[PDB]
């Protein structure tokens, strides 16, 4: 198993993640840690690609308590619509991204949250796989 990395630990909320891809680990960071996040937050992402990301899709599963709150799929890179500059980069390339993700200005209540994130190609080949935990407390 890959080690668990600390994204946030700012006296209150703790964000942890772990790679579920057996082949490799990856790096991920945020610019700032808070209970209240602004729209279009900035992330940092480092990885070796195991597949061409001409077409890339994200799967998200957010869990609170035990009730599955939210499943969604979203395309990040597409033949008809490359949303980001790194779209169309190829297998074996080392990627580094520092920029926004498209997120609504939203706030999260207190409690424990479990998150699964999968990035995959057209053939459903794994680019990235993440097992993440969010712990929020008093303020």
């Amino acid at each position: 198993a890959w080690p668990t990395h600390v994204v946030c630990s700012d006296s209150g909320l703790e964000v942890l993640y772990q790679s579920c891809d057996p082949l490799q680990d990856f790096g991920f960071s945020v610019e700032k840690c808070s209970k209240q996040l602004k729209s279009n937050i900035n992330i940092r992402f480092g990885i070796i690609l195991r597949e061409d990301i001409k077409e890339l899709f994200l799967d998200l599963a957010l869990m609170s308590q035990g009730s599955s709150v939210l499943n969604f799929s979203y395309p990040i890179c597409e033949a008809a619509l490359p949303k980001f500059s790194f779209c169309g980069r190829r297998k074996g390339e080392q990627i580094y991204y520092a920029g926004p993700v498209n997120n609504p200005e939203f706030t999260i209540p207190q409690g424990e949250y479990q998150v699964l994130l999968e990035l995959y190609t057209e053939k459903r080949s794994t680019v990235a796989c993440a097992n993440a935990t969010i712990m929020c407390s008093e303020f």
């Binding site: 082949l23 070796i48 008809a80 619509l81 490359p82 949303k83 980001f84 500059s85 779209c87 169309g88 980069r89 190829r90 297998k91 074996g92 390339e93 080392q94 991204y97 920029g99 926004p100 498209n102």
Partner: protein, 601 residues
Amino acid sequence: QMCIEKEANKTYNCENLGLSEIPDTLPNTTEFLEFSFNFLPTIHNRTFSRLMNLTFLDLTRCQINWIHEDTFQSHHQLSTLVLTGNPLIFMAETSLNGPKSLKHLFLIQTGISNLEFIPVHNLENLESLYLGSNHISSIKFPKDFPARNLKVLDFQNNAIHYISREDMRSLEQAINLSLNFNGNNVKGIELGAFDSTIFQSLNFGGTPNLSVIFNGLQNSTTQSLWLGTFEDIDDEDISSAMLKGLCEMSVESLNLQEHRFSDISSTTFQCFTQLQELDLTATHLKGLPSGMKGLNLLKKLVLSVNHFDQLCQISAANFPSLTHLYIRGNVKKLHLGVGCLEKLGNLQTLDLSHNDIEASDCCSLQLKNLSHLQTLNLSHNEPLGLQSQAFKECPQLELLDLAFTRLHINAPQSPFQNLHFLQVLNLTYCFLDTSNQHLLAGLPVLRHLNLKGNHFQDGTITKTNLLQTVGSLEVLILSSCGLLSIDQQAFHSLGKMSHVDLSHNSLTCDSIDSLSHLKGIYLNLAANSINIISPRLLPILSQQSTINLSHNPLDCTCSNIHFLTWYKENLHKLEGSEETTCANPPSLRGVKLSDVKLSCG
């Protein structure tokens, strides 16, 4: 140890095995080899020497530092070499000599800073050169470098800021060249650098200044020009003054995605007269003005991912010549309005998917005057109330996509009536009332129907059913319909069928009876409840050209003996053979049927 086999003596995958050399277990006649993510610090005249018949070599991320003299001398049939992501220090002068026709070379992210790094005297047959993600700021190739067969030249994610005449002259031998400058920072181009050179595609994705590109592309000829930006790149708004250079250009297709327009007006597109296709995806459009000049002869227009409230806001009168219109995934909920596209007489293909379109009465007022329409995509929308003859205004329609859009249709109305030319009808997850026997009436030439995700009464298809009106059907999909049984006569008015998909239901062997009157079909019975297939049903199976029986709780005992011997004999007819496993006895649970050899008497 060991490699994955994908074809007899032909294709092998050795990815991620951490090998220092080519396994001596791999056969001499290996043509396609995936050897990425292994460990080859130096490759030489001996490393691949025993696999003389290689045609495709992928050496991605193998940590290669040295490619020595005459490495590929023996490999006369090598067509594709992938060296992406190797920390290459030096390539020998004769390191790529040998292949009679080396067509594709991938040197992406190899630390290349000088174009002189590439060994020149065996690149004559090269069709693709990929040089992305290196330290390249100048595209000037050395002299002696051949470009006559070159069709794809990729410089994605480099640091090219300036393009000169002499830079481009090293490419004069090429015609119909695709150049990719995506992810660069071109801030200057020598005026008329691209003169008389004929390009297939030019990509300047993420380019800082559109003016520089347009001005610099004066007197040039290209089919496709990609000038889109991205969500992560900040751009200045596009003024019409920036788009002037288009008049001095020969362009067929143009992409301007993710850009924002500065005060969109009637003359904004005046230089677009020679253009056939225009892609304005995610261009923050709230609408287009009427009386727009320079778009009179446009054939294809993409207005996907914009901010329209009603279809009339696109001002279709601007585009009388249009044959293809794509408006997919509008950011707001899209309203169709009344006759918004009536002035589009020549239109043949309309895509209105993913728009949250909601109409209680559809679609006569909405698709008014669309008499040339052949392809209509209305899938992934909110519910639509269909009248009888819902598509009266599109008599010439050949393909109708309504997948995942709930349809409110009243018994016993026929919404698709008088579509005498319809061939393809996709109704997956439309929540149809299948008890309406007239639903598919008035489609005399329908040959492809998708009823995936629909419910049937009692989970059964009886003798009198929906499909009786579709006697010309060839392709039928009934997957994920929760079917428990099909009547043996339920497909008797369907004599022409060659593709039947019944996967992801709860059918048993009794379902095969409904196919006895058919020969040479593709039969998909995957993910069902089939365990024993009685020998009386085997001749029916023998009549068919290709059969899928995977993910079935199949019985591997003596009660199912006749089928098991049949299975092994007809292995050429079987799709998903390695996913076809036993459920009983518990002793064989997970074991492929092709491995099973039973004995009785």
